[PDB]
Amino acid sequence: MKAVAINGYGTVGKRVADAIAQQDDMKVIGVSKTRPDFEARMALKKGYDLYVAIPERVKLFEKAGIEVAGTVDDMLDEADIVIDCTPEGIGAKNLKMYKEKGIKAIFQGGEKHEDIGLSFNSLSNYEESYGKDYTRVVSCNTTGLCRTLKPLHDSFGIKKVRAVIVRRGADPAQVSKGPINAIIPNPPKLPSHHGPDVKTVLDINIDTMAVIVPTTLMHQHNVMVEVEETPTVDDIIDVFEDTPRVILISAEDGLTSTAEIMEYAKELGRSRNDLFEIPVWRESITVVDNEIYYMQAVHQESDIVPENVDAVRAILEMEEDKYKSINKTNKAMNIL
Amino acid sequence: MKAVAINGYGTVGKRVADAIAQQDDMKVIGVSKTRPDFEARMALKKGYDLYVAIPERVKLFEKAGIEVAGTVDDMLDEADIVIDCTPEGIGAKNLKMYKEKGIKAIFQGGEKHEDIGLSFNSLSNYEESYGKDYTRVVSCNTTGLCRTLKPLHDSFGIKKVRAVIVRRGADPAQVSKGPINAIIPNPPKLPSHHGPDVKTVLDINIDTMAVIVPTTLMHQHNVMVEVEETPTVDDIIDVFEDTPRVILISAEDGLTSTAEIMEYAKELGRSRNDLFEIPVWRESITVVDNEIYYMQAVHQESDIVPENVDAVRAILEMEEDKYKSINKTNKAMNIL
Amino acid sequence: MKAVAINGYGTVGKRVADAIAQQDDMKVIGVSKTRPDFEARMALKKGYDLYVAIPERVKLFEKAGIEVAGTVDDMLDEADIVIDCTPEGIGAKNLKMYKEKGIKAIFQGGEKHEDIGLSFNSLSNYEESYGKDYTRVVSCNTTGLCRTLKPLHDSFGIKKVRAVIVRRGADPAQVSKGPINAIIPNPPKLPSHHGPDVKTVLDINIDTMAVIVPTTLMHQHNVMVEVEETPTVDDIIDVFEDTPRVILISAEDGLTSTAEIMEYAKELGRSRNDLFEIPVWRESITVVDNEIYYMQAVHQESDIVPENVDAVRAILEMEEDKYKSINKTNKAMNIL
Amino acid sequence: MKAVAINGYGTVGKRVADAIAQQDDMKVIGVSKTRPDFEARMALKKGYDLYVAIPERVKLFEKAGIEVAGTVDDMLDEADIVIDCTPEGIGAKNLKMYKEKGIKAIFQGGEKHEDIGLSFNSLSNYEESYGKDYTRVVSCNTTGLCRTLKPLHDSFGIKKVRAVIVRRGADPAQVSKGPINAIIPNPPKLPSHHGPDVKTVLDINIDTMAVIVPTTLMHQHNVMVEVEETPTVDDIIDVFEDTPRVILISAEDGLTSTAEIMEYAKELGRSRNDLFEIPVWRESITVVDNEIYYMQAVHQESDIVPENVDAVRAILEMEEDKYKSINKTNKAMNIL
Ligand SMILES: NC(=O)c1ccc[n+]([C@@H]2O[C@H](COP(=O)([O-])OP(=O)(O)OC[C@H]3O[C@@H](n4cnc5c(N)ncnc54)[C@H](OP(=O)(O)O)[C@@H]3O)[C@@H](O)[C@H]2O)c1
Ligand SMILES: NC(=O)c1ccc[n+]([C@@H]2O[C@H](COP(=O)([O-])OP(=O)(O)OC[C@H]3O[C@@H](n4cnc5c(N)ncnc54)[C@H](OP(=O)(O)O)[C@@H]3O)[C@@H](O)[C@H]2O)c1
């Protein structure tokens, strides 16, 4: 088994832990935490070995009755690779340590591309990470945009993408963040960061705008794409039905909003009721001459999870063909 | 096993369906819907036979490509008991039809006690439904209050309960309901109806007040109980730890809010990440004079689920010992 | 003064009544209500004669303690014009009575353009309502897009507009409407109604998309405009500074969201804390080749109010110059 | 006229500045800010002299185009009293400077009673601040509880108060604070701070519990009061109608929530559409034996405002009869 360490057992971290553990060629040998809370105790219940960020906080865990295996420094001595799921900006800080231990690592979307030097999205540029040392899985929204823009680019040739991102204010468990009742340009200076992030893995012309609204469940995307070859609605539907980690939903069938989508995710019975796939509203798919309009949604806590599994296989050279990794990841995770 | 029909496969009904199906002594022989949406299609994927409320709607399902097994009248012919999970007021109307077929039935808390004649809560009055025909499982909030007040009455003797209910405005999937940004007395004439409802199953002196606020996750209760024999905080903690379906949580461990409680439920991994249990904040348990103050929360979509399973064992005379049924329901549901 | 009647003293109608009354050449001779609640009582406190929608409701107001002047039929006999602010679809029903009485009327944006025959926006098509009988002031979002797209068209020649509307779910006082926690495509089939609606007053190529989010304060617009003449950011700023009822704001000065904008509107001290103007985030104004990007917001309860006052001048032939009416309206309303 | 300085032109401070300016015996000689934002610019629009907290930030305001009159030190030399409206804990730090200056001052409810020495509520203990040096106007919720508890105490004699406070998460313009979707015990260790805070101004036995919910508009209170003399619903209604700054509203009249109350406040037309008074739901007034139950709401941004004007008259010995200051304050502020 490749031995994977998870530095940061948080929102992404705990889900990546489980997805890695579900594969047949990897196992989790450690997850880390900085504070002794209910997630630290649930890691133990789930069978993981729990490690502590810095050595002087180990006494905290001891005092709360939480068994500790050691520190992150010890956790990395035993890994083949480490998946960094720490807060934005901490991953780059952890990189000095990773290089000093000579261990390879995968970072999440909140890190800057140029601190890591390489960005990953399984369908768009899996081969750019093959046999590399360090790679950044792009963000939840960036990932969601690539899921449908990549297959569009291959089939019809992207001329220009204009997208407006309606972002969730805070994940379900983050109770200290707003807004309670506001719409916030994010940021007001345009265009937003999503464009340039998409360009780190997919070479297309794209401008984005984003705002923040008082919802916690999912982000929502308003996408407009000018293409080179004239598509039809029927052609776009087949492309989305065929592409991996994308599903078509219907408002007519009752999925009129991100709340009803997450309700559907609860009926699917996967880990945490998560929706790793990007749902596209079928009724929204529209063609105006050589321009495609459509709406989609992103379950921000889990869409990047499968991308982390695929990234391990690229970085550790376990599989050279991205489709094989994608497919094996999906089978072990019960992806739709 | 005993063959159970579920009339009304909605928020409560789809959950009761799965809980019956987990039992070793019961099975679901059908669930019913009135419209062909995604939940109707998920019902077929869980292996349930789908029945349509009225004969003239069978063709709506046929044209949507959803295979139906018959009408509600047909479903009932196959069952030993029907669990009615139809909207408030419809249950009373279905009572007539159940009488005509003769089938025994369980109703939900939205129905009036006067129209059903009996109310039910597993720990406080299981024996009053034993071998009877029809019983009303009390509402989400009423069940939540009984879970902690019954054990308090048994150990210390309740003299008076004063409770203020902070209600969630609408379930997560219900997007057409408010409020978006208000606090609404519910109702403004006091005392509210949770008190009388608790008294249909638990013979105590209780006055309640309630409001609605902009959240969908859980209800939150502020309870103040005057007792006959004043206990210590440790005694109360012992009582709550020993009573079934009540858990103790701590804000010191990170469960500072209903959003973090539901995050905890997602790490538990039961069906739909539900929280069947009533969580009490350990640090809130306080004794002032001869009175106990505490705070708890209720996951309104599922705290009544297990109660419905126990009501089937009482109504059909499968188990005369309320503790043996509660224990068996709990093992099959993976309840804490 | 011209005698103006307000049929429907609701969200828009109470605001239109105060704006009409502030004018030096118009006065309110009555407002109507269907139910005797607190706003019926406040209408009397403001000096307005209060009329009842239907005559068989006069007794209802009288035993509620509310002194009524008569019915809507009596109201129209007192007026030179009626401004209809009834719920969507009722304005077209009232149109029949207006015609039978022989009275000119102005309608709101929720009516269908085809049931009215003429739409109005003060800056883009004032002259088309000059001396006519009936006209529809376009909706809050339609008005907001016209305020900035008209001047852009006049200066650079619009070739194509793409706009994403992020809509508030329900006005502050509307506590029974959601969504509490969701993003809802509105509708899922595109393009949405805003584009065609803009075209009833402004002859341009425009496609819009829209969603509803859990906010009450303001709608927010993401606007992308391809123009004929190459624009510069400083030139657009001058255009927007020069155009009536448009203001430039900055996130650097603390106006980072719709909530801080509305806070700024309470500092202005006009009627009900309203923001009649369309605020454009200064920093969002971007030029890419011949394409302009910018974000704006809309205080949906009141951006249409000043349009109604200019529509009366058009309809009753009080002023043929649209800039004289706009400036006269702005001065009486204390519009920036 | 007494020359008053406002230190901290924020949520409370901007409102206190206007209320002071409205009096015929006081004037505002200055308001202070720390950052040059839209509120600093609006202070100048309103005619106030703007002072900067720290001297090196003077240049910072000047460079932003904001004419400054000097530093806080300068401002305090021009005043007979300073009303501190700085963030919690900051009042205490500033008290040292006020003492060094020999200037009397009023603090807001965020400061600790022990750090200031004395607390104030106009009706409850106005005389305790008569001629003193420093006093603390108690918080929005403490003031709200005292407005109806004091009169009930005087008429019937309070034996015990049990209250559950439903708190708004963040003020309308605060967009960085949550929760978006949760209920948070505040705190989980009971009883809460309101009880002890009421006792700094009113000598009664009271226990409180508080929670935070996703609303911005008003707090809401659920109040249970055991009293010595047997009350009747009608005598309570007369007691609240007769008491200053308390109004009776009804759900039947359309005021069913905090959002509809605030809608009523917008029809009243005072400064910023505030609601300085405490609304009590008339239909919630209930008597059971010798216990009164009732619900009220608080507009947290302004209920403390008139209290601050009365504190100035107490502190500066401008009036010794608390009813004369209350009534004069009410008349100048257009209070019901
Ligand atoms: N939030 C999303 O939906 C999302 C989606 C995709 C990608 N991302 C990105 O993924 C990354 C992680 O985000 P997240 O939401 O999962 O954050 P999170 O929930 O706050 O999790 C961060 C985890 O890192 C741990 N941690 C903090 N400092 C650490 C340190 N110095 N060393 C080791 N562990 C440390 C924390 O432990 P303690 O809790 O005990 O302090 C926590 O378990 C960021 O780059 C973010 O932008 C986030
Ligand atoms: N919601 C809670 O949190 C909660 C908790 C505890 C107890 N309860 C109580 O449980 C009951 C059900 O509430 P709920 O939230 O589950 O309602 P719900 O989600 O609206 O579900 C009602 C279900 O009944 C079906 N239905 C409607 N009319 C029917 C009829 N004539 N015959 C058969 N099925 C019919 C509906 O089918 P279609 O959807 O296809 O139209 C739907 O599946 C009420 O008494 C409620 O007070 C609710």
Ligand SMILES: NC(=O)c1ccc[n+]([C@@H]2O[C@H](COP(=O)([O-])OP(=O)(O)OC[C@H]3O[C@@H](n4cnc5c(N)ncnc54)[C@H](OP(=O)(O)O)[C@@H]3O)[C@@H](O)[C@H]2O)c1
């Ligand atoms: N809502 C907005 O923000 C908004 C913004 C811009 C434009 N508009 C458009 O303005 C129009 C009105 O919307 P609104 O939000 O102001 O509606 P609203 O608040 O519901 O007010 C409608 C008013 O009409 C009265 N009414 C109902 N039926 C009536 C009848 N048959 N005859 C006379 N009066 C009657 C109601 O009286 P009672 O209350 O006594 O029943 C109420 O006073 C719609 O076309 C809407 O699309 C709305």
Ligand SMILES: NC(=O)c1ccc[n+]([C@@H]2O[C@H](COP(=O)([O-])OP(=O)(O)OC[C@H]3O[C@@H](n4cnc5c(N)ncnc54)[C@H](OP(=O)(O)O)[C@@H]3O)[C@@H](O)[C@H]2O)c1
């Ligand atoms: N928020 C409420 O609803 C409320 C209600 C009742 C009572 N209170 C109590 O009222 C007090 C103030 O709260 P708030 O909501 O008004 O706060 P706020 O909105 O944050 O305003 C505080 C003001 O103080 C200024 N300030 C900050 N540091 C300063 C310093 N060192 N010297 C002088 N001025 C300084 C800030 O200026 P800048 O903006 O330029 O930085 C701001 O103008 C607290 O005790 C609070 O607990 C609050």
